[PDB]
Design a protein around this ligand. Structure first.
Ligand SMILES: Cc1cccc(-c2cc3cc(C(=N)N)ccc3[nH]2)c1
Ligand SMILES: [Ca+2]
Length: 223
């Protein structure tokens, strides 16, 4: 997260860290047994870490649970990142509490102008590299589809939306991928891609979760 702020320990209880010996992507807890992340975050040997703030220090509210199964969207295209969404099932149900909670799925899509909360442990620099130990937060509005498509001609599909600021300075970044974009209490996006980080006229691109609710619910119910 570039141009953001320190969320505060466990202020984003649904935020998860995917670990394969190190933090490599974010995710969102949707119920005690399932996590939603980006398909491009797929990897074998994933351990889901919940209740995290400083990912390099055991602070006392963590829950480390190995993934038992991963399900990348049937139509995921790694070349274009269309349908960049994946589900991860926990080997054992997480113990829900004030610091480890699920985020509700949307019942309808969000409109341009809606403010959202984007979070993660990704790079905090627009130029160069610096990875934070504590969770970073960023408030950003959903942008018009036209401004999104103008920035990335021919690359934006109906399963993607842009959020952030065209002037630059505030954006999600490498390491935040797979993480949450929550608007009006609903998980509306997943950190997916973009161009550089916090660059002018190059907003972040997010997977449009409202298009996948039917798939998510049916998949979780059958697995
Ligand atoms: C699979 C793959 C290949 C090459 C680049 C990316 C990527 C761009 C990007 C841009 C942002 C951003 N500035 N919001 C966040 C995460 C991001 N991930 C992903
Ligand atoms: Ca920790």
């Amino acid at each position: 997260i570039v141009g953001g702020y320190t969320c505060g320990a466990n202020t984003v209880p649904y935020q998860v860290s995917l670990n394969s010996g190190y933090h490599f992507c974010g995710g969102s807890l949707i119920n005690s047994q399932w996590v939603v992340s980006a398909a491009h975050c797929y990897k074998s040997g994933i351990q889901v870490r919940l209740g995290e703030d400083n990912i390099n220090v055991v602070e006392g509210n963590e829950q480390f649970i190995s993934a038992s199964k991963s399900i990348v969207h049937p139509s995921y295209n790694s070349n274009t990142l269309n349908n960049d969404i994946m589900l991860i099932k926990l080997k054992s149900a997480a113990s829900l509490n004030s610091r480890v909670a699920s985020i509700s799925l949307p019942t309808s899509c969000a409109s341009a102008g809606t403010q959202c909360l984007i979070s993660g442990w990704g790079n905090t620099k627009s130029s160069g590299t610096s990875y934070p130990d504590v969770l970073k937060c960023l408030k950003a509005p959903i942008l018009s589809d036209s401004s999104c498509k103008s920035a990335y001609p021919g690359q934006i599909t109906s399963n993607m939306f842009c959020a952030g600021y065209l002037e630059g300075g505030k954006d999600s970044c490498q390491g935040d991928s797979g993480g949450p974009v929550v608007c009006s209490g609903k998980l509306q996006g997943i950190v997916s891609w973009g161009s550089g980080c916090a660059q002018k006229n190059k907003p972040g691109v997010y997977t449009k979760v409202c298009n996948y609710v039917s798939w998510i619910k049916q998949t979780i119910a059958s697995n």
